[PDB]
Design a protein around this ligand. Structure first.
Ligand SMILES: CC(C)CCC[C@@H](C)[C@H]1CC[C@H]2[C@@H]3CC=C4C[C@@H](OC(=O)CCC(=O)O)CC[C@]4(C)[C@H]3CC[C@]12C
Ligand SMILES: CC(C)CCC[C@@H](C)[C@H]1CC[C@H]2[C@@H]3CC=C4C[C@@H](OC(=O)CCC(=O)O)CC[C@]4(C)[C@H]3CC[C@]12C
Ligand SMILES: CC(C)CCC[C@@H](C)[C@H]1CC[C@H]2[C@@H]3CC=C4C[C@@H](OC(=O)CCC(=O)O)CC[C@]4(C)[C@H]3CC[C@]12C
Length: 422
């Protein structure tokens, strides 16, 4: 109680503003893929181009996460938030000027800018929660921050199909709809960036928590990211957890990117239904994350719960694979909901397991490695599954995903640890 601790209303504002612009970023990640056929027709490109529009996020994250983490640690929260918001706004504005049949590269540049923004955006939740919220409010603030990005992904799934119908016959109408969507996104991003500039302060006048007061009082300490990574790789259980988490997240990313292709293969004129399926998957994933966190809290064992969740995710993936072609959209809805539930439920559990197993290694390095593995696996799975679907049909790529999930289960079982919640 020696230092003075107080809570300011501005924290909520900050938690809102980030949760908004981060949301927007997530939207921009999946806007193209969900209507990938429409953009393919408009730009006269192949589906691989639209897949790369989504994979640029993953590609940009891998080489910039560690530099971004260092910048956040050294310069503070405000600079990172401003960078993320401004980059997202600039990417949206560039996309606004990319609405033409011969200007795909402008949209690619805007998407790359949004990808660079994501690197700054993704790391802010926990740091903001610690800096601006008290001990009891930290968990809720972090949950809201992550839910912002998840809701952004869900909205990116749902909205573009409604906003941009597949009017390939009329180029003017398609261009007008794409321009409307881009201008709306740009306006929202600009407003959020202005709000971040005006109100997003570095930290409150007084620390919200005693732990935050101690952290701020402590002098800065330099950390060697390379040494931390080398020590982490020595931990074979952590390597196995990294591989499994990357496999699962990459499978989710590949399914999200190629969902439109799989749905359009068997159901025609169902882009809106595909977006609804994606939104159902994301919402079920949120619910599964909450329920799996509760299950882990009750049972208190990382290994058993993680393995069971992985097995359930594999079963759901197989069910979706072998039910997609039944030509019933409701079955696709249910299977996608179950699959997203289990897949997104796995992610927090695996992340916590990897963070705890790596102790006392810095959480930043482990988080960066986990996310980089997720991005790499997502890129590889997206490429392989897209090629398989184009050449042999969605079932081949889905079976490839199922095989990778089975390999992930095998790796998870091989993990040797008795770690328990403390
Ligand atoms: C600044 C950071 C975020 C990195 C940004 C990198 C991108 C500008 C690069 C990385 C991978 C590239 C893609 C890698 C492979 C392809 C497939 C390629 O396909 C063809 O040329 C097919 C031609 C045919 O149809 O015969 C077209 C370019 C494209 C989309 C590339 C476009 C430019 C990309 C997205
Ligand atoms: C498990 C599979 C699927 C993914 C494995 C990924 C790693 C092997 C790669 C991915 C990103 C890489 C990092 C990307 C950027 C940098 C910054 C780079 O900075 C420097 O050159 C200076 C470092 C210093 O200050 O000592 C050092 C290597 C490092 C940490 C890299 C180390 C190796 C990493 C973690
Ligand atoms: C850990 C990594 C290295 C695993 C890689 C596994 C791939 C080599 C497998 C996984 C899914 C397989 C595909 C699943 C389904 C099919 C459909 C299949 O269709 C056919 O024409 C033959 C069967 C039939 O008659 O229906 C042809 C092989 C193919 C593309 C398979 C080719 C081999 C794939 C890509």
């Amino acid at each position: 109680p020696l230092p003075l601790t107080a809570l300011s209303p501005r924290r909520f504002v900050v938690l809102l503003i980030f949760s908004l612009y981060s949301l927007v970023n997530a939207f921009q990640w999946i806007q193209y893929s969900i209507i990938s056929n429409v953009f393919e027709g408009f730009y006269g490109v192949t589906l691989l181009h639209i897949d790369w529009l989504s994979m640029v996020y993953m590609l940009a994250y891998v080489p910039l996460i560690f530099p971004a983490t260092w910048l956040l640690d050294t310069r503070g929260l405000r600079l990172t938030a401003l960078l993320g918001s401004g980059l997202n706004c600039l990417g949206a504005w560039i996309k606004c000027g990319s609405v033409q049949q011969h200007l795909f590269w402008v949209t690619m540049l805007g998407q790359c800018l949004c990808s660079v923004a994501q690197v700054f955006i993704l790391g802010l939740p926990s740091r903001i929660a610690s800096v601006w919220f008290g001990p009891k409010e930290v968990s809720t603030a972090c949950a809201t921050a992550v839910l912002g990005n998840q809701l952004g992904t869900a909205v990116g799934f749902l909205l573009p199909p409604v906003l941009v119908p597949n009017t390939q016959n009329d180029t003017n109408l398609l261009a007008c709809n794409i321009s409307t969507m881009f201008y709306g996104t740009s306006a929202v991003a600009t407003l959020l960036f202005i709000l971040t500039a005006i109100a997003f302060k570095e930290k409150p006048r007084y620390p919200p928590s005693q732990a935050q007061a101690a952290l701020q009082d402590s002098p800065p300490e330099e950390y060697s990211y390379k040494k931390s990574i080398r020590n982490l790789f020595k931990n074979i259980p952590f390597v196995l957890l990294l591989i499994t988490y990357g496999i699962m997240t990459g499978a989710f990313y590949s399914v999200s990117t190629l969902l439109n292709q799989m749905i359009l293969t068997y159901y025609e004129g169902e882009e809106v239904n595909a977006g609804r399926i994606g939104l159902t998957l994301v919402v079920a994933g949120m619910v599964g994350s909450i329920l799996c966190g509760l299950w882990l809290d009750y049972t208190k064992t990382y290994k058993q719960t993680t393995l069971i969740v992985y097995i359930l995710s594999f079963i759901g993936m197989v069910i979706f694979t072998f039910t997609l072609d039944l030509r019933y959209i409701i079955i696709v809805f249910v299977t996608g909901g179950v699959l997203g539930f289990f897949m997104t439920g796995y992610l927090p559990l695996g992340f916590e397991f990897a963070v705890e197993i790596t102790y006392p290694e810095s959480e930043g390095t482990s988080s960066g490695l986990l996310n980089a593995s997720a991005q790499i696996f997502g890129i590889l799975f997206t490429l392989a599954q897209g090629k398989l679907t184009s050449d042999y049909g969605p079932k081949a790529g889905n079976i490839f995903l199922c095989v990778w999930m089975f390999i992930g289960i095998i790796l998870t079982a091989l993990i040797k640890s008795d770690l328990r919640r403390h």
